[PDB]
């Protein structure tokens, strides 16, 4: 009964990754080891140390 309740493991695809902060599936930044979605990065970026500079 405990088996038919929790996932098959995924080593690739789209259900392999998940946001650290919120838990989203699709849009995820992977650049240089980051694992945040496009939404949480825009909020936590000035804490990580990023600037506009443009």
Q: How far is CA 20 from CA 3, 14, 33, 40, 54, in A?
A: 25, 15, 12, 9, 28
CB 21 within 8 A of CB 44: yes
4 is in an annotated binding site: no
Place of tokens 């240089």: 32
| Of 8-16, 20-28, 45-53: span binding Zn ion (CB under 5 A) | 20-28
Among 10, 14, 18, 39, binds other proteins (CB under 8 A): 39
Residues comprising the binding site? 19, 22, 37, 40
Interface positions with other proteins (CB under 8 A) = 20-21, 29, 31-36, 38-39, 41-42, 44-45, 47-54
């Amino acid at each position: 009964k405990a088996d038919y309740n929790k996932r098959k493991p995924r080593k690739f695809g789209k259900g392999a990754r998940r946001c650290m902060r919120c838990g989203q599936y699709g849009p995820i930044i992977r650049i240089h080891g980051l694992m945040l979605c496009r939404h949480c990065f825009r909020e936590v970026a000035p804490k990580l140390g990023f600037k506009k500079y443009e």
